[PDB]
Amino acid sequence: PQITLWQRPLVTIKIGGQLKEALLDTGADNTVLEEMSLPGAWKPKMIGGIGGFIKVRQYDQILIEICGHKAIGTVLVGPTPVNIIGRDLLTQIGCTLNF
């Protein structure tokens, strides 16, 4: 699967039994999801982007299906306006930039 970038690279993901749309984001170090509940313990965390910072809950060893590829990683949950798939998970699905 090749994905061109003329439109936002939004893919379907499955996480915590739920189906969501998320943006494949090579500029994000971490994967950040809009508010939802997940299993295990979590830790308070802060992540900065353009403009400022948000408070997030960090969950470890979470199973995620990304465009029908399975990966297990750390997911952050918090007041992001878009679900973000960052490099931590992009590497796990063998995602590369090519030109």
Ligand X SMILES: Cc1c(O)cccc1C(=O)N[C@@H](CSc1ccccc1)[C@H](O)CN1C[C@H]2CCCC[C@H]2C[C@H]1C(=O)NC(C)(C)C
Residue 26 vs residues 6, 19, 77, 84: alpha-carbon distances, Å: 15, 22, 18, 10
Q: Which is nearer to its own copies, 35 or 39 (CB)?
A: 35
Residue 67 in contact with its own copies, rule: CB under 8 A: yes
> What, of ligand X, its own copies, none, does residue 40 touch, CB below 5 to 8 Å by kind?
none
As annotated, the active-site residues are 25
**In whole angstroms, what is the distance from residue 29 CA to residue 58 CA?**
14
Q: Which span sits near ligand X by CB under 6 A: 33-41, 42-50, 67-75, 89-97?
A: 42-50
Please list the residues that pair with 72 across neighbouring strands: 63
